Structure 1
Amino acid sequence: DSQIQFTRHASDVLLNLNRLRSRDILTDVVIVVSREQFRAHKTVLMACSGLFYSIFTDQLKRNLSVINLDPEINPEGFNILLDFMYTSRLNLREGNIMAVMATAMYLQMEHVVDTARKFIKAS
């Protein structure tokens, strides 16, 4: 359209959302993955994950303050993906590819899943 495009604005917003998460400012949910807990903003979770979107869009579950993931989900793989959500940077390596891909499929993060497929292809 005719509007001025700020190419860095979305990245600046996300960096500031990550700063708010680092200070626990306005976080409203805890994700439990076995023995670990991770605080986050439900809006960011919904904007990144089909699983979280499907949970919180339902008015029955929108006010949930705790979500328990499947016990077969790897806490390290979840943390890598939560960091990705808030940075646009994905820590993919041969030592973690299968755990990250499993967690991305479970969380319904289609672009990360497509990227992990491309990673396996270029390995």
Structure 2
Amino acid sequence: PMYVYESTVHCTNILLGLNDQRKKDILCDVTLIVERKEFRAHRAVLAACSEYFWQALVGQTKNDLVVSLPEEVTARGFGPLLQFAYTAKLLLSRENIREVIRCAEFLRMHNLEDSCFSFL
């Protein structure tokens, strides 16, 4: 007979830990340059999220990997999307909602249109 445990909190706790690492720049492995701003990340997390980042990061080897995103990607739209990849949460205002949606479109994140948003 088998003993089974399925942790309901585990997946979310790991990502929380990954995000804490990102924020403190611990154990990251890529720097993304987006509109001249540097963003540290775990390539594996980004690739898990988007087929865009998979294609962009799978080949890579260079000791200190640095990847510049093209000009369609702005810092204002990207920051919240990087945060989302880790937290599963977006919380935007009128200043950035347009840019975030447009960025998500460029990065081919399928289900992030106007209609996915609710109000607090």
More strand by share: 2
2:61 maps to 63
Structure 1 residues 73 and 56, CA gap change in structure 2 (3 angstroms):
closer
- The separation in 1 between residues aligned to 2:28 and 2:42, in whole angstroms, is 5
* Number of residue pairs matched by the alignment: 115
**2:74–2:103 Cα contact (<8 Å) kept:** yes
What secondary structure sits across from 2:92 in the alignment?
coil
RMSD: 2.2
Between 66-75 and 91-100, report the one with greater CA deviation.
91-100
Query: Partner residue of 1:105?
Result: 105
The one-letter code sitting in structure 2 at the alignment partner of 1:67 is: V
Aligned to 1:52: 53
For structure 1, which runs of at least 5 residues remain unmatched after alignment?
A: none
Q: CA deviation at 1:119?
A: 4.4
Counterpart contact for 2:29–2:40, Cα < 8 Å: yes
Q: Which has the higher helix share?
A: 1
The TM-score, its normalising length taken from structure 1, stands at 0.81
The equivalences for 1:19-34 within 5 A come to 19-34=20-35
1:85 aligns with 2:82: no
Q: Secondary structure at the match of 1:110?
A: coil
In the alignment, does 2:38 pair up with 1:40?
A: no
Give unpaired runs (5+ residues) of structure 2.
none
Alignment pair present for 1:15 and 2:16 = yes
Runs of 4+ in 1 over 4 A off after TM superposition: none
2:75 maps to: 75
